[PDB]
């Protein structure tokens, strides 16, 4: 699958 | 007192000029935030969190996040006003609000209102600091059309509530300070003191970074208490202690009670067991009722007759004596096997018996565990569920789901009858399966597919317009989720529910426990987000954050500051430090370059904003959690105020009347109304405003995500560690 | 600042100072030289600094994170003893009897420096016009501190650091008194350059010496600020003369002396050694071959090589197994041949280095860094390839595979082009050598570097081997590889081959080593059991195990004199209370304190308080590993401070008139405030007896020379002090 740049546009963590 | 003569002046312009400019900049701020507010029709960035925390409020389930409850309760309150039930969970970025109608336009509109209302508060802060109407307009414009402030304040984020509460705190404190200079202990003095405290409470009740706003106002309040302690202020120690005790009450004690009030509301609303339980003690969990789903949840045993329901379409796993057509409409060959379909009404053809694998020692009344091999027997046709290497009616890549006779399924086709209730999380493997509470994928063991269904297209007349059931090769897809709805053959002993007896606890004990857990989890949580940024990069806006991407349309939302604007802000800060150092050096040489009124502007409002900016910037060099550009966002509101102010001060007649005499000496003559060079000042502000507006328009496709950019247009916007999607 | 106080004659005859300095120096000598031959084994960081002394004597290049001066001083004692550097100090507990290093001479050198610190501290307070008993007491707090004693009797850098800090404080006080009396005298120049010299030794020992530069720099700026005032009566030309001379004496000359120690270091260390792995190939070309053996074999075209990852020790490996047509997340692979990281040497680790198609480059020509190459896997007869297919675990990184010779000589030729990319741009075009030259295995077409990790292993289809992928973050230090072996090496190339030493300019050599020093120092973020945070240091709440003998149940434990340390914490708190009370009372028009008491408080005491702040608070901003010994510079200043503070408390501090500010020009004030010597001496004796009692009680753990019963061990365990043999 095409690599793609940047990232998956993630959220930030919420504890465990 | 600090800037007493400057701040007690009448306004430099008629009120009609202020009313004109505040209206224009508020209309620009409104237009920038409400532009295409319905799009993207998808969950963006941290909408995955705050949206969820809201819903959980509507369902009354107990959660736990590292942030105080106030801003999440304000978001949930908009949902409550819309009659939203909390059904939609915002689980991932890109989830369609069209599938499950969450009042996302109302949530985004609430934030867009708060972001818009920040602008006139900023304007009125400088108006009350006696700056010109154009200066107030310009400083507020730098926030009205900043790309980062716009992007954040149109999405379902906490930062709209934070930023307006910080702006309100600065404004209320300036109003309080003017009342303090005119006449202390007036009714207006009490109103503005308690309004500063109330706004400070909303800041810390939104995010713990709000301690920086307490530090900024606390420093200014201590500096003013220090001036009131001076003898040359004729303040009898009793009058000083009256100032101290009233400020302690208004700025610390009352805000702390309001902070505790939001936790009291939070624990009163969240009275049912939920995803937060794992973070709390058993004694805290004893204060929570059982979830409505857990009350009706029954352990699923082998030889239980169950109904299996799809989470997204509400359809039951269903089968009947009708058969797949020997060829589908596209000419592919089916098995001509028995149909398995999704049916939205409860009937006898929804009934499946859970059987153990052949040759297992597992008897009647033993619990089914997640990820164990099972067989499903359709009760009405006496056939085993089967999946095989035959393509499904609508999806050529997915498998047809059928049923086989008991004799054939106990013979050669035995492997093709093996399913598992695969858990959504690997942590949940080997847990007991329960009705209504445990979601799973119905996983086929041999071909490694998950059972799936959809409601965008229904089977033709030969499939009775029922939903297709197929074997999806994308096993991890959240649309492959099922639940056991009912256990039809449940024994009378297993029917009896014993309600948990809710045990009460001391609000303060409940609050202390939750607060310790909040600080412990905030200090831990170690990861490396492909978007974390260090404090040194923020004033330059050298990197940003991807908020959303659509692969098919090549569209994206990217969080970044208005580089031209943030850089004006920086260059200012440097010029002001240069002015203060030059004033200090020249005075130490007996050379008094600056007029008294220019110094009252520099060491009063400009120093207040400079120290307030320092409080919102430098403490981040002493922290170590994950830090993302949003914080320079609060400090940027403050530094925009500062920039407008310092540049107005510069374009003024700053010269002392006599360079050999200190105009600060009592009885010295000084110019009370320094002339502003309005013509060159207005041209300068228009040039900077046009450059900031040009940048905002140039980046508007990345603020709104509403325009597809060609790869060359994407690459033309890579200005620094700015990595954008679709540059290739 | 404190002009009238510091220009007074000494409060006592010189014979009293000479008596007390002699007594406290003899106590310091006795405490450091007690059983200096014991243990007859390598202790704690003697494993590092003894080893570095050996490498200086052998002239073998090493690389460490600390400047060279203090290690060269240790090595210089070995050189004076005729020691050859044979003993390596490899582990704690190694006997000095089997391989005789001059360990008694090294320990004695540190014990001399630790002893000489005490009279410098004494004379610092003497020059600040404090009484002889005050000077004695402050110096006694360092003479019989358990941490200062333990560190200054072992082969450690801290003896050289602490004496250089003490000398810096003393020289600056002497300079400041010369500045108050008569600036630009010969004595003023001597003390200015002596302060600079001592500051140079501080930063040339450890980078924490920047805190001593900050302390002296602050005091020098405060005094330059007073000289800039129009009331000082100086012309701008006279001020600029002060500025330029202080800049020269406190910055420029110390920086030249700092560079001089690196020049000596590179002149002494002229042979290849364990430091080579931290430096560029261009730096390594400045080093002679060791008189021993070097495996730095030149890699030639058509050599068969093994390529090893630096962080995971895995070899670049390939075999006939193929990537699955889809990964577990549903992404499509090439279904190409697998390239993996394998930790064991085998035939599938063998790659032939081939030149690009159509190159005139023949067998036996050296491969140069950053030249295009191809890698042929010897076992499968396939070319290494990277392409725009995502890797198994990292969607942003490229899958690394192999292609047939026919396809790789056809359309896929660009995708078979790699380079041994140097870590430094200065090293481009140098000859590639096995074991010594680190590189990134860079793919030319897609601009990725080959990378591997060991936190997650490939599933059963990849045999639980490490993933090899094309990392887009090319500059990442985890992308580093080395050629480990040349499998097809000719018999002539196996025997030793000489090396033409190439010269490098000193400043280039120094800049490279300095960058490597800061980069490696910032990477010291592992967890260590004895690591401690700045908040625990002033309380001495935890310590460090330095040595243990299991058979004799004996141990050395590094901890502060807790009675002495708290007494200093109380002293710091009392002073802050006094300053806050003075500021509040003055703001009310109440002038409680005499002018001379204020000159002591806002002069020497404030100078030591700010100097302590400079050696303590910056550690809260440091995210690297930290340890209790980092507080010894601050404790040293806190000893001077506490002695001085309690003399002030036991002085007649009262103003003559509580309604009049004695700081106003022409106000009458008491010039010679009476010290209440009797109660002050009783107080100092009581505190000295308590500190001495603690030192005696902990002496078995300072010296390691007495076996303690488990109940006696447990009786010394309090707070987070964990001792060996408590069971
Ligand atoms: C100034 C007042 C506020 C705080 C004091 C500094 C706190 C520690 C700073 C980082 C130290 C360090 O060593 O951090 C650096 C990384 O920070 C930097 O680039 C420093 C950026 C500094 C920008 C300018 C700041 C001062 C502006 C006024 C002049 C190296 O560490 P690293 O690269 O391993 O990153 C972990
Ligand atoms: C000038 C101010 C310099 C102070 C702090 C600079 C670094 C800021 C972060 C740590 C603050 C610690 C601190 O201010 O120390 C306070 C000292 O207060 C007191 O006990 C009372 C003394 C009087 C108040 C002044 C204690 O906090 P801590 O050391 O346990 O903080 C955590 C330290 N970790 C980060 C290493 C864990
Ligand atoms: O949603 C905002 C929230 O998301 C996560 C982190 O980025 C936090 O810094 C931030 O408070």
Short mmCIF file of C-alpha atoms in Angstrom, two decimals, chain C residues 256-479:
data_model
loop_
_atom_site.label_atom_id
_atom_site.label_comp_id
_atom_site.label_asym_id
_atom_site.label_seq_id
_atom_site.Cartn_x
_atom_site.Cartn_y
_atom_site.Cartn_z
CA UNK C 256 42.10 29.88 25.55
CA UNK C 257 43.17 27.74 28.57
CA UNK C 258 40.10 25.51 28.01
CA UNK C 259 41.17 25.02 24.33
CA UNK C 260 44.78 24.36 25.48
CA UNK C 261 43.63 21.25 27.43
CA UNK C 262 41.98 19.84 24.25
CA UNK C 263 45.17 20.60 22.30
CA UNK C 264 47.17 18.59 24.91
CA UNK C 265 44.50 15.82 24.86
CA UNK C 266 44.74 15.36 21.03
CA UNK C 267 48.59 15.60 21.12
CA UNK C 268 48.87 12.90 23.83
CA UNK C 269 46.15 10.63 22.30
CA UNK C 270 47.67 10.02 18.84
CA UNK C 271 46.89 6.26 18.52
CA UNK C 272 43.63 4.50 17.52
CA UNK C 273 41.55 3.33 20.52
CA UNK C 274 38.05 2.71 22.04
CA UNK C 275 37.07 6.37 21.29
CA UNK C 276 37.26 5.85 17.48
CA UNK C 277 33.61 4.64 17.22
CA UNK C 278 32.40 8.13 18.37
CA UNK C 279 34.36 10.10 15.71
CA UNK C 280 34.28 10.55 11.93
CA UNK C 281 36.55 8.61 9.55
CA UNK C 282 38.37 11.96 8.85
CA UNK C 283 39.18 12.30 12.59
CA UNK C 284 40.26 8.62 12.76
CA UNK C 285 42.70 9.28 9.81
CA UNK C 286 44.60 11.62 12.24
CA UNK C 287 45.29 8.62 14.55
CA UNK C 288 48.17 6.18 14.14
CA UNK C 289 47.40 2.47 14.04
CA UNK C 290 47.70 0.86 17.48
CA UNK C 291 51.01 -1.07 17.94
CA UNK C 292 48.49 -3.95 18.30
CA UNK C 293 45.95 -5.09 15.65
CA UNK C 294 43.27 -3.07 13.74
CA UNK C 295 40.36 -4.74 11.84
CA UNK C 296 39.62 -1.44 10.01
CA UNK C 297 39.91 -3.35 6.69
CA UNK C 298 39.26 -1.31 3.51
CA UNK C 299 36.05 -2.45 1.76
CA UNK C 300 36.58 -2.94 -1.99
CA UNK C 301 34.14 -3.49 -4.84
CA UNK C 302 33.31 -7.23 -5.20
CA UNK C 303 34.00 -7.80 -1.47
CA UNK C 304 31.41 -10.01 0.30
CA UNK C 305 30.43 -8.19 3.50
CA UNK C 306 28.18 -8.51 6.54
CA UNK C 307 26.33 -5.28 7.47
CA UNK C 308 25.46 -4.87 11.19
CA UNK C 309 23.06 -2.44 12.87
CA UNK C 310 24.66 -0.34 15.65
CA UNK C 311 21.73 -0.18 18.12
CA UNK C 312 20.22 -3.72 17.79
CA UNK C 313 23.37 -5.69 16.80
CA UNK C 314 21.25 -7.28 13.98
CA UNK C 315 22.74 -8.20 10.58
CA UNK C 316 21.11 -7.22 7.28
CA UNK C 317 19.65 -10.61 6.32
CA UNK C 318 17.55 -12.14 3.50
CA UNK C 319 16.09 -15.57 2.62
CA UNK C 320 13.74 -17.26 0.09
CA UNK C 321 10.60 -16.48 2.19
CA UNK C 322 8.29 -13.73 0.84
CA UNK C 323 6.21 -10.94 2.36
CA UNK C 324 2.51 -11.91 2.76
CA UNK C 325 0.34 -10.41 -0.05
CA UNK C 326 -1.49 -8.40 2.67
CA UNK C 327 -0.28 -7.31 6.10
CA UNK C 328 -2.57 -7.66 9.18
CA UNK C 329 -3.86 -4.06 8.76
CA UNK C 330 -4.94 -4.91 5.15
CA UNK C 331 -2.16 -2.93 3.33
CA UNK C 332 -0.82 -4.66 0.19
CA UNK C 333 2.84 -5.73 0.19
CA UNK C 334 4.98 -6.39 -2.91
CA UNK C 335 4.88 -10.15 -2.11
CA UNK C 336 8.67 -9.77 -2.71
CA UNK C 337 11.54 -11.58 -0.95
CA UNK C 338 11.88 -10.73 2.77
CA UNK C 339 14.76 -8.57 4.06
CA UNK C 340 15.05 -8.85 7.86
CA UNK C 341 17.36 -8.14 10.81
CA UNK C 342 18.99 -11.33 12.18
CA UNK C 343 21.16 -11.33 15.35
CA UNK C 344 23.17 -14.50 14.51
CA UNK C 345 25.94 -14.74 11.86
CA UNK C 346 24.93 -16.97 8.91
CA UNK C 347 25.28 -17.32 5.09
CA UNK C 348 22.09 -15.20 4.57
CA UNK C 349 23.91 -12.16 6.10
CA UNK C 350 26.32 -12.06 3.11
CA UNK C 351 26.06 -9.17 0.63
CA UNK C 352 28.41 -8.54 -2.30
CA UNK C 353 29.22 -4.85 -2.91
CA UNK C 354 28.80 -4.16 -6.63
CA UNK C 355 29.49 -0.94 -8.53
CA UNK C 356 26.72 0.80 -10.58
CA UNK C 357 26.08 -0.59 -14.08
CA UNK C 358 28.56 0.78 -16.70
CA UNK C 359 31.20 1.95 -14.15
CA UNK C 360 34.92 1.38 -15.02
CA UNK C 361 35.48 0.31 -11.36
CA UNK C 362 37.31 -3.04 -11.08
CA UNK C 363 38.08 -5.68 -8.40
CA UNK C 364 40.32 -4.34 -5.59
CA UNK C 365 39.29 -0.65 -5.85
CA UNK C 366 38.15 0.85 -2.52
CA UNK C 367 34.47 1.81 -2.02
CA UNK C 368 34.13 5.52 -1.13
CA UNK C 369 31.44 6.96 1.17
CA UNK C 370 28.39 8.47 -0.60
CA UNK C 371 29.15 6.64 -3.91
CA UNK C 372 26.33 4.74 -5.58
CA UNK C 373 26.55 0.95 -5.09
CA UNK C 374 24.38 -2.15 -5.47
CA UNK C 375 24.12 -4.95 -2.89
CA UNK C 376 23.71 -8.53 -4.16
CA UNK C 377 22.48 -11.10 -1.66
CA UNK C 378 24.94 -14.02 -2.07
CA UNK C 379 22.55 -16.83 -1.03
CA UNK C 380 19.56 -15.92 -3.30
CA UNK C 381 21.49 -14.13 -6.12
CA UNK C 382 19.15 -11.09 -5.93
CA UNK C 383 19.76 -7.30 -5.73
CA UNK C 384 18.65 -5.33 -2.66
CA UNK C 385 15.70 -3.06 -3.58
CA UNK C 386 13.58 -0.34 -1.96
CA UNK C 387 10.31 0.96 -3.47
CA UNK C 388 7.11 2.99 -2.78
CA UNK C 389 5.47 0.08 -0.85
CA UNK C 390 4.80 0.60 2.86
CA UNK C 391 6.67 -1.56 5.47
CA UNK C 392 4.84 -4.18 7.68
CA UNK C 393 4.78 -2.13 10.95
CA UNK C 394 5.38 1.48 9.74
CA UNK C 395 2.90 2.81 7.08
CA UNK C 396 5.17 5.82 6.38
CA UNK C 397 8.36 3.74 5.88
CA UNK C 398 9.25 1.68 2.80
CA UNK C 399 9.34 -2.12 2.50
CA UNK C 400 12.87 -3.39 1.77
CA UNK C 401 12.99 -6.39 -0.60
CA UNK C 402 15.16 -8.02 -3.29
CA UNK C 403 14.80 -8.34 -7.09
CA UNK C 404 16.16 -10.81 -9.69
CA UNK C 405 19.35 -9.87 -11.60
CA UNK C 406 17.41 -9.56 -14.92
CA UNK C 407 14.73 -7.19 -13.51
CA UNK C 408 17.30 -5.19 -11.47
CA UNK C 409 19.47 -4.72 -14.63
CA UNK C 410 16.25 -3.68 -16.49
CA UNK C 411 13.47 -1.22 -15.49
CA UNK C 412 14.05 -1.52 -11.69
CA UNK C 413 17.73 -0.45 -11.96
CA UNK C 414 17.19 2.95 -10.15
CA UNK C 415 15.48 1.13 -7.18
CA UNK C 416 18.63 -1.05 -6.68
CA UNK C 417 20.93 1.98 -6.12
CA UNK C 418 22.20 2.48 -2.57
CA UNK C 419 24.95 4.57 -0.97
CA UNK C 420 27.01 4.17 2.19
CA UNK C 421 26.02 7.67 3.32
CA UNK C 422 28.47 9.12 5.91
CA UNK C 423 27.15 10.29 9.31
CA UNK C 424 29.04 13.60 8.74
CA UNK C 425 29.19 15.54 5.43
CA UNK C 426 32.95 16.05 6.09
CA UNK C 427 33.46 12.31 5.56
CA UNK C 428 32.05 12.17 1.97
CA UNK C 429 34.56 10.55 -0.45
CA UNK C 430 36.57 8.81 2.34
CA UNK C 431 37.44 5.11 1.95
CA UNK C 432 34.91 2.75 3.57
CA UNK C 433 36.48 0.47 6.23
CA UNK C 434 35.02 -2.42 8.25
CA UNK C 435 34.26 -1.94 12.01
CA UNK C 436 35.43 1.74 12.15
CA UNK C 437 33.21 3.59 9.63
CA UNK C 438 29.56 4.01 10.60
CA UNK C 439 27.17 4.93 7.75
CA UNK C 440 23.48 5.10 6.81
CA UNK C 441 22.51 2.60 4.11
CA UNK C 442 20.77 5.22 1.93
CA UNK C 443 18.42 4.40 -0.97
CA UNK C 444 19.11 6.78 -3.90
CA UNK C 445 15.71 6.86 -5.67
CA UNK C 446 13.23 7.28 -2.73
CA UNK C 447 15.75 9.06 -0.39
CA UNK C 448 15.15 6.73 2.64
CA UNK C 449 17.67 5.14 5.05
CA UNK C 450 17.55 1.45 5.99
CA UNK C 451 16.47 1.04 9.62
CA UNK C 452 15.61 -1.72 12.13
CA UNK C 453 14.20 -2.03 15.66
CA UNK C 454 13.84 -4.68 18.41
CA UNK C 455 10.77 -3.44 20.40
CA UNK C 456 8.48 -5.48 18.09
CA UNK C 457 9.42 -8.60 16.02
CA UNK C 458 7.84 -9.77 12.74
CA UNK C 459 4.99 -12.37 13.07
CA UNK C 460 5.42 -16.14 12.38
CA UNK C 461 5.61 -15.47 8.57
CA UNK C 462 8.79 -13.36 9.23
CA UNK C 463 10.27 -15.95 11.68
CA UNK C 464 10.21 -13.48 14.65
CA UNK C 465 13.12 -11.57 13.04
CA UNK C 466 13.58 -7.78 13.18
CA UNK C 467 11.88 -5.69 10.47
CA UNK C 468 14.14 -3.90 7.94
CA UNK C 469 12.40 -0.81 6.53
CA UNK C 470 13.18 2.45 4.63
CA UNK C 471 12.97 5.24 7.23
CA UNK C 472 12.12 8.71 5.77
CA UNK C 473 13.80 10.33 8.83
CA UNK C 474 17.25 9.74 7.22
CA UNK C 475 19.19 11.80 9.83
CA UNK C 476 17.89 9.59 12.73
CA UNK C 477 20.91 8.16 14.68
CA UNK C 478 19.10 4.79 14.91
CA UNK C 479 19.65 4.43 11.08
#
